[PDB]
Structure formats: C-alpha cells, structure tokens
Amino acid sequence: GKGNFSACTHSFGGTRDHDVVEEFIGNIETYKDVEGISDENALKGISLLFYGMASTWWQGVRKEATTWKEAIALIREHFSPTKPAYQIYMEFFQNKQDDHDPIDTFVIQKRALLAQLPSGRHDEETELDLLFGLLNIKYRKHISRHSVHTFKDLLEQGRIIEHNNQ
Amino acid sequence: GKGNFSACTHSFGGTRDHDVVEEFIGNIETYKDVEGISDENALKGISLLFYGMASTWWQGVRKEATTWKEAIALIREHFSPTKPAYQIYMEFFQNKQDDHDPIDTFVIQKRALLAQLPSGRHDEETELDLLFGLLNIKYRKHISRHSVHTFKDLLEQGRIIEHNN
C-alpha cells in the first residue's frame, strides 16, 4: 500500500493555542501509522501541510533537523509548551461542582483531565478517592464511600438518584 | 483493504436517546462493510468521527478498549441506558388517547412501547386485554371485548367505525 502525504486533508496554521496543536499532531501521527508510509520518506514531503503563516518558519529552520522525531519535537517546542504535572494538579481542585450540572458531564470532564499524567502512576482506587471530594451536597448525603467498587457503579447510583427528582 | 473514515458524512455529537445512536451505529456498520476496511485496522481511525463532547469522552476512556466489539459495546452502554421494568408500566398508563387521533397511530405507539420488556413474559391475549381501558368513548360503544382476538381485527373494526363517521 504505497502512498505519501499528498492526499491528506489535515492542515495547521499559525494559531498559538494548545488543543489545536495537540489534535493536529495526533491526527498526523495516526495517519502516518495507518497508511504505512515509510519512516523516512515522510520527512521529504512534510512541507505540503502548512499554511502561509508557518511556511516561512519552516523555511527558516529546515537544517536543524535530521529525522522525524526531532521535527515533531521541534514543532511542539516552538508553538506550544507541554504541560508539566503540577499545573494539572492545580487545575483539578479549583472549580468545585456547581449546583445544576448532571453527574455524567462532571465525571466525563474530570476523567478527560486525568489521562494526561504519566501512565501507571495511579490505579483505579486512588483515582476514585481523589474524585470523590468535590461532589455537590445533593449526592454526598445518600451514597457513601463504603460501596463504590470503581466508576461504573457511581454513575449508576447517580442516575437512579437523579431520576427521582432529587 | 485499507482506508480511513475521513470520507463519511456521519457524526455523533452525544444526545441521550435511542433512535440517533441506533441509526448512527447502523450507518457506521454499513460503511465499514461496504468499503472493505478490516477490524483491527479500523479501530485506530475511529477518532475522526466524534466531535464536541463525544471527543472529550473518547479521550477519557481509551485503554479499556482493544477490538471493534468492545468499542461498540462501550458506546451503546454509556449513551443509551436500558430502562428497568417498572418505568415502562408507569409510562404506559399515563396517556389516554385524545378525541382527535386515528386508531393506527395510537395502537402503533402503544405497541412500540411494550417490546422493551424481557422476551416471553406476555401472551397476545393478555396484552390485548391490557390495551383496552384506554380507548376513547367513540370506539368503545360499538366493538365488544368478546368479539375480537388478534390485533388484525381491532384495526378492521376501527376503520369501519371511522369511515361511517
């Protein structure tokens, strides 16, 4: 299954946010792994994925690279610093649950913010312990910490306690 | 024997209902069967379909999946709860038919709401006996309960009573 980058529909501009750079790097890497392009052939044709605001920057620093990993690391370094751990822990305990959001959206967002720490440092139990201190008073007064036995149960008891009109 | 999902027009933003999740899962299945993509080469590309809240949700739970079957099971499990027994019975007796509604739509809705109970729990006779007690007065003054059996006849008597009026 020979191929190259010519057909790809993804592209990246000069935006200086974080989510855009992360989604772009992830999509490009998954495409390169799925279509079977060679590990070195891709570097010779990467220039077809840049707008008019970043092409000058790529022209300015082409020679400070030799293999694909260095180029991806260089993009990540210049356009958006990676988050260190302490800022993640700081963000997790800031905004406590409001008085209107359903439990499902809260659990989804908190789980989405907790996967960015290095893998294997936290198994299921301590994660459930960290999450349990911020729930709003409507749920804490019925369900307790005696019986949770992982996440799948907490959503179930929360849904049954939510259908009952509080 | 290879390809991405990038060509599709379907996307699932996340809403707690049944018809939307069912139609989306069916369209994705037909697409994967038609373009020939294989099972383990297909899971890697699944991320391109989700958007909005569904993207954050898939970013959450990802290490619990391993093959295509687990992914469909997780989507169906988290985005369309199975209603327990008693709520269906409670929903069933809280909505009598109005004066302005043909027999067909009413019987079709009340039948569609009854198939979610566990299979084999009911007989055609007991179900039809349950269906009465809600029909509006315009139809109950003619057809009698001991002159009908299967569902094929109630629609017939209702149509003849409707056309005369």
């Binding site: 529909t9 592209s11 707008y51 | 027009t9 379907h10 996307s11 958007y51």
Partner: peptide, 27 residues
C-alpha cells in the same frame, strides 16, 4: 430532513461541515 445547507448532505448542521470549517475554505 435538515439537509446540510452548504454541502447539501443529510448528515449534519450548518455550524460544523468539513469543507467550510477546514480544507482551507472561508477565504
């Protein structure tokens, strides 16, 4: 039903469409 206003496909809404959001359109 709710045929996509731009791409003329029955699969989504105006706000989000592959041709309009990205694919270097909106020039």
């Amino acid at each position: 039903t709710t045929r996509c206003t731009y791409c003329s496909f029955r699969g989504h809404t105006f706000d989000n469409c592959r041709k309009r959001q990205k694919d270097r359109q909106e020039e």
